[PDB]
Amino acid sequence: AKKHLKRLYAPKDWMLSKLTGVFAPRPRPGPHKLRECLPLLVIIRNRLKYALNAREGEMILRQGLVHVDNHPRRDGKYPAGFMDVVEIPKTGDRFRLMYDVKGRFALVNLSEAEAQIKLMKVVNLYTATGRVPVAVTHDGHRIRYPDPHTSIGDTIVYNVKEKKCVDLIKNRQGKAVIVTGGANRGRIGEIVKVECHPGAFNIAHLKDASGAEFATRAANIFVIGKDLNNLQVTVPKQQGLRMNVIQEREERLIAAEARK
Template sequence: MAKMGSRKHLKRYKSPKHWPIHPKEDKWTVKPAAGPHSIESSLPLLIVIRDILEIADNSREAKRILNNGEILVDGHVRKDYKFPVGFMDVIQIPKTGGNYRVLPDEKGRLVLHPIPEENVSFKLCKIEDKTIIKGGKTQLNLHDGKNCLSDESFSAGDVINLKLPEKEINDAIKFEEGNIGLVTGGKHIGEIGKIKEIIITKSARPNTAVIETAEKKTFLTLKDYVFVIGKEEPVISLPGGK
């Protein structure tokens, strides 16, 4: 039993701090399945349904809701209660009319931000890198494990507006000065602002970016922490009405 528990479950005290569960309520909690997001940057669907949205009183009810095909992630029905959802994923619950985008709050916790029906048909995905595949086509490898083909000229760090669930590219936002960025890591996680300067180093030190907030305050963060979300203004709504 101990071996099965360690395989299928996770000790509560070892769960990520952003999970909304009490470490002393029980010894075990659900362990996310291998998927598009790591344990540290995701939430298992069971916790989303039972502990965050509270549309189920217990694990059994949550599993029944999932088995009935009532939960969609990025336009696809997901029935695995261990399925990990993470940054920018779109969650739909047609039965209740609830629509959400997974985003970080100012404390770095993943939250389910309510979005209107017209916003469920797209998702912003950051290009992590590119691969040339058979036939000379360019494959874009995205932050959430997805990939898609494109003939256009994109660079790592650019963000594409992806149509769901078809995975067709609607638009793109370049990682460049003047565009709006959301900080996804470090001490400024959850903050947004205009990219004032991109600092490229010629050493082993990481590249950085200077971000200017709406209050005209500036701060420095790692380039990899900046996720562009718009040109003149964000194309998505954000927690706290930002």
């Protein structure tokens, strides 16, 4: 099977320079999809800058100094992804892997009693041997006894340290969601309606805080709160609000001139 990953073929969100190397670290199979993940080596070397190169990254990772969802992960090819909690106890670092308004990965700093909570979107529900209902989540977790009201597309806020479900947010109109894929990835809005096309892709029509209306496929939405006012997780700085490109360029130019 494929063991390598050309740097040109690597996801653009990893921000690896096309001139520095032929290859990029190929994510191993695991919790998240290869195209929708951030490798641990990329996090430790290119984002956190704790490692100058891969050899120092190996030094840090093999010692189990980096924890993902309250578990040391020693593989630099481990596929960390959305809503994962990454903690380095030695440096006192705690952040959640999320998407900013531009669709890039963002390390949102977390406090204690916040790093113990992780949201998981239910992608499948089946019955195991012994008539045991099992819920499969977006990060590959299998839950042996979910809430009876759990449905596919819902989100389970899950205590990683105690390994137990603590609450469930249903996937209904009026709920706050974050887009996890497509051109609208990273936007935060409220479900206005969901159009159902059986045998095809359901379309979710959303509306952000400023009132902008956008759409995507139902697979790309991720419920994160009862409504936009009360979210169940800390979001990045820009709060999932897409901002006009012309206005953004003008504000950056003014801010740059104010600095100098």
